[PDB]
Amino acid sequence: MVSVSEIRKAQRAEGPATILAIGTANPANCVEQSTYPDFYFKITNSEHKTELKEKFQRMCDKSMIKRRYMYLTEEILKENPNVCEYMAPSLDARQDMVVVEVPRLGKEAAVKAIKEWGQPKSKITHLIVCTTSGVDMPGADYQLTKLLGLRPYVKRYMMYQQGSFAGGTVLRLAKDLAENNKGARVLVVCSEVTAVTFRGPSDTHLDSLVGQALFGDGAAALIVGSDPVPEIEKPIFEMVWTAQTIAPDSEGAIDGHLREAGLTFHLLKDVPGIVSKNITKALVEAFEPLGISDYNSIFWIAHPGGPAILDQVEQKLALKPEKMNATREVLSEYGNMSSACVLFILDEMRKKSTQNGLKTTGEGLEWGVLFGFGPGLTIETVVLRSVAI
Amino acid sequence: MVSVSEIRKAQRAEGPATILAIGTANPANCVEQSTYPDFYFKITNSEHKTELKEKFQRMCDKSMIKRRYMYLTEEILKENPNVCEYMAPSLDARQDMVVVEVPRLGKEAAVKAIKEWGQPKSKITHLIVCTTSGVDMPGADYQLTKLLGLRPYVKRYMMYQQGSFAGGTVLRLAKDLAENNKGARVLVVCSEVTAVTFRGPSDTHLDSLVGQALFGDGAAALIVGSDPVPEIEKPIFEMVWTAQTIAPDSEGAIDGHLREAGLTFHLLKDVPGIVSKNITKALVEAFEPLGISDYNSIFWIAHPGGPAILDQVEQKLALKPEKMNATREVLSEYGNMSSACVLFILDEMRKKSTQNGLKTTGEGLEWGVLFGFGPGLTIETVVLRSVAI
Ligand SMILES: CCCCCC(=O)SCCNC(=O)CCNC(=O)[C@H](O)C(C)(C)COP(=O)(O)OP(=O)(O)OC[C@H]1O[C@@H](n2cnc3c(N)ncnc32)[C@H](O)[C@@H]1OP(=O)(O)O
Numbered sequence: 001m002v003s004v005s006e007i008r009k010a011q012r013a014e015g016p017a018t019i020l021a022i023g024t025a026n027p028a029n030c031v032e033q034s035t036y037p038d039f040y041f042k043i044t045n046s047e048h049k050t051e052l053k054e055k056f057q058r059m060c061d062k063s064m065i066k067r068r069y070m071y072l073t074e075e076i077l078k079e080n081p082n083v084c085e086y087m088a089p090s091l092d093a094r095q096d097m098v099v100v101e102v103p104r105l106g107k108e109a110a111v112k113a114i115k116e117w118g119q120p121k122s123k124i125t126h127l128i129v130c131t132t133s134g135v136d137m138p139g140a141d142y143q144l145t146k147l148l149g150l151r152p153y154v155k156r157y158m159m160y161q162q163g164s165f166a167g168g169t170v171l172r173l174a175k176d177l178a179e180n181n182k183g184a185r186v187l188v189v190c191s192e193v194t195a196v197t198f199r200g201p202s203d204t205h206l207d208s209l210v211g212q213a214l215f216g217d218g219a220a221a222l223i224v225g226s227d228p229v230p231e232i233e234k235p236i237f238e239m240v241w242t243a244q245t246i247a248p249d250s251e252g253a254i255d256g257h258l259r260e261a262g263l264t265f266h267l268l269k270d271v272p273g274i275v276s277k278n279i280t281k282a283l284v285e286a287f288e289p290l291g292i293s294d295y296n297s298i299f300w301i302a303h304p305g306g307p308a309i310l311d312q313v314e315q316k317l318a319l320k321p322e323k324m325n326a327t328r329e330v331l332s333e334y335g336n337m338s339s340a341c342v343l344f345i346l347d348e349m350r351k352k353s354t355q356n357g358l359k360t361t362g363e364g365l366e367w368g369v370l371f372g373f374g375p376g377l378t379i380e381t382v383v384l385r386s387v388a389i
Numbered sequence: 390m391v392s393v394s395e396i397r398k399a400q401r402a403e404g405p406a407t408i409l410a411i412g413t414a415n416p417a418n419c420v421e422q423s424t425y426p427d428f429y430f431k432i433t434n435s436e437h438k439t440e441l442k443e444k445f446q447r448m449c450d451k452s453m454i455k456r457r458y459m460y461l462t463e464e465i466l467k468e469n470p471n472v473c474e475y476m477a478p479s480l481d482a483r484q485d486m487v488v489v490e491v492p493r494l495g496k497e498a499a500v501k502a503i504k505e506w507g508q509p510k511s512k513i514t515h516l517i518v519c520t521t522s523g524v525d526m527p528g529a530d531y532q533l534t535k536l537l538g539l540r541p542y543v544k545r546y547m548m549y550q551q552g553s554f555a556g557g558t559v560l561r562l563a564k565d566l567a568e569n570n571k572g573a574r575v576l577v578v579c580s581e582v583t584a585v586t587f588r589g590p591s592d593t594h595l596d597s598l599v600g601q602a603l604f605g606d607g608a609a610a611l612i613v614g615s616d617p618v619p620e621i622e623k624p625i626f627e628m629v630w631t632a633q634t635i636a637p638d639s640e641g642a643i644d645g646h647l648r649e650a651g652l653t654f655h656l657l658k659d660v661p662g663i664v665s666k667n668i669t670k671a672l673v674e675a676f677e678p679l680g681i682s683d684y685n686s687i688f689w690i691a692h693p694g695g696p697a698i699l700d701q702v703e704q705k706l707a708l709k710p711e712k713m714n715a716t717r718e719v720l721s722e723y724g725n726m727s728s729a730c731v732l733f734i735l736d737e738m739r740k741k742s743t744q745n746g747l748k749t750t751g752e753g754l755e756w757g758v759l760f761g762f763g764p765g766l767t768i769e770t771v772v773l774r775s776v777a778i
């Protein structure tokens with residue numbers, strides 16, 4: 001009787017998964033980067049560790065971040081001395097913060113993205129929620145469902161404790177959800193709060209110190225779907241091919257452990273050099289099949305782990321300086337927001353290109369690449385195409 | 390120049406995601422249910438609590454569980470008194486145990502599945518790993534890549550802190566991964582270890598007391614793929630349709646919080662009646678399109694949260710007593726192993742059907758249903774088609 005192949009032909013979408021809307025949010029508290037070392041040493045009761053402040057000064061001076069947005073305020077840190085210490089039991093206080101903040105911030109971003117899209121929220125068929133800050137049951141995907149008033153049957157993908165490469169990983173997942181299901185509209189939400197990682201300075205874990213110079217909060221939300229309705233929905237970027245890989249020789253480059261003292265990050269190798277050394281290989285796996293080899297001829301999105309990863313990739317490939325502008329603007333204005341970062345980048349780029357009358361949303365170029373970098377050393381690759389105007 | 394539609398048509402698979410191999414593993418420590426009450430009340434120094442202990446003994450005797458496999462032994466518990474109190478700082482100790490044991494026990498289940506499949510492990514293109522115990526960076530997905538030797542460019546989906554419905558989630562996931570990607574072969578691994586949730590008794594927290602009587606350890610692994618190679622690969626079940634919903638009036642029915650004291654679970658509503666009240670809705674969403682209304686003419690796989698879930702569903706629907714046989718038999722031999730449990734039920738049903746010479750792997754019937762139940766209160770539905778012989 002019932003035929004599965006008829007069911008399967010009727011059930012699937014036909015074209016490429018497309019980004020149809022993008023919206024972001026950050027916590028109100030703006031933290032200036034120039035005065036941060038003072039603030040950070042005072043609030044962590046470390047003024048006396050004079051030599052360690054000099055090193056953080058330099059790290060912030062070199063970060064290429066102007067400001068960061070943070071849920072943690074001095075009023076909040078005053079109330080929490082165990083979080084200002086380098087290693088004290090604090091996971092219950094940090095979880096109370098981030099199980100609420102993560103979905104609140106996520107909701108902000110998602111309302112934005114849904115207004116842009118224009119279409120009834122009841123048409124949202126799937127939800128991906130991604131965060132590296134805290135875990136809970138029901139997850140932030142269930143909170144976000146309630147907060148936004150999504151249908152209770154929305155199909156949910158909760159991606160918890162992912163790491164900084166996961167803006168790449170949510171795209172890679174939405175691609176297949178959108179593409180395999182006719183009519184599917186996926187609401188994608190990356191929301192990262194560093195309240196779980198903030199800790200005091202320690203002269204014997206400089207790698208934790210580097211983290212403290214760079215990470216910032218932010219959420220980004222996307223509407224993803226295949227076969228857009230022309231002149232009703234508005235394609236921004238199309239996803240064409242994706243990959244995930246683990247660099248050779250990179251065991252321990254980036255690890256993070258959730259413990260009683262919260263999420264402690266540990267940098268045990270040369271991340272800038274490991275990305276730069278393996279990005280060519282990623283490029284040729286993505287573009288060799290498209291016949292493209294000039295990497296200045298595609299538009300770029302690269303998670304800005306730190307400025308050094310960017311310079312060292314730019315140097316290695318001979319990218320023109322201009323290739324990393326969008327990526328650097330996002331790093332300057334918001335710091336490293338982990339998984340959300342690459343999505344703020346995509347907004348930046350598409351906004352600048354439209355604002356400035358370029359021919360496509362990918363800086364006037366046809367084909368583009370987004371890279372996610374994080375624990376494992378993992379590299380996520382998504383190949384994009386822009387959309388005219 | 391380059392055609393995205395020609396790429397999209399060449400990239401995607403053609404037929405239904407199909408389950409091609411299933412392997413399971415459990416810790417070697419076998420815990421008998423009949424004597425658990427005495428053992429647990431002794432190892433947690435709670436033998437004065439006579440009324441409570443009697444309460445427990447009625448839960449264990451009604452559980453319909455004969456034994457469970459537990460990584461936690463007497464020797465381990467004796468080096469972790471913090472783990473035997475109801476609420477003592479002990480997440481660091483418990484994480485150390487599960488960050489290692491989850492991947493360890495998944496590897497055992499995966500090797501078994503890979504061996505049944507018969508093909509080179511380098512043809513594994515995607516890996517879904519699911520667990521409610523422990524979180525870490527790089528994740529258990531990374532550990533299992535390294536541990537099994539999969540290619541470094543295996544596409545990973547690390548599902549953390551999911552809970553007990555996530556046997557359905559991982560199949561819903563794996564269906565789109567396999568269907569949208571020509572040649573994709575998805576290794577699926579659910580591995581659950583109750584070391585994060587094990588704790589002593591408290592008379593003001595009987596809900597926690599109930600999970601202590603039911604949760605057990607275990608991992609199950611699948612190979613999922615579309616367009617199986619005829620006579621080289623061997624289909625066991627096909628997936629046809631899936632759904633995830635949140636039952637109405639169930640906020641806080643199952644909560645789980647990861648804290649400095651480990652994973653604590655809270656039952657704030659009536660789980661067995663929420664499930665039973667909402668299970669018919671789920672069945673008509675699933676089977677009305679298929680023209681099927683008789684719920685005894687399909688085969689059944691239900692997450693056994695506890696035996697009252699099963700008996701209340703059975704009574705609501707007037708299921709013959711035998712529908713629930715494979716479910717019940719896994720409950721009896723292993724207890725509630727959270728996400729892994731529904732996968733062990735597929736294995737049991739297909740092994741019994743085959744061993745007894747029935748016509749299909751779904752007990753001789755064509756169509757079946759698999760249900761996952763857990764935090765939300767969430768209901769995961771997967772519609773399955775059996776395979777001849
Ligand atoms: C969320 C999950 C996953 C994580 C992944 C992605 O986010 S932490 C994730 C990835 N981020 C990174 O890997 C950071 C990469 N590093 C950078 O971006 C940059 O190194 C920087 C912004 C920190 C500093 O810029 P520069 O490298 O241009 O400048 P410079 O080398 O003089 O840095 C000054 C301070 O070096 C500091 N320093 C910074 N990183 C250092 C490192 N890995 N090893 C040693 N020292 C380091 C030392 O104190 C150094 O020397 P002095 O003592 O002389 O002052």
Ligand SMILES: CCCCCC(=O)SCCNC(=O)CCNC(=O)[C@H](O)C(C)(C)COP(=O)(O)OP(=O)(O)OC[C@H]1O[C@@H](n2cnc3c(N)ncnc32)[C@H](O)[C@@H]1OP(=O)(O)O
Pocket residue numbers: 444447448451452453521551552553554599600643645656658659660661693694695696697698725727728762763764
């Ligand atoms: C991993 C993430 C996801 C979690 C989700 C799914 O796994 S823990 C969540 C899934 N499981 C459930 O949700 C609940 C399932 N409950 C059951 O299966 C059953 O009630 C049971 C096996 C525990 C007990 O069997 P019975 O119901 O047949 O028998 P009985 O009623 O006499 O149970 C004995 C005692 O259980 C305690 N008890 C158990 N559940 C109770 C409840 N909801 N409200 C009140 N009391 C309860 C009582 O002590 C009762 O009275 P005292 O004798 O005074 O005799």
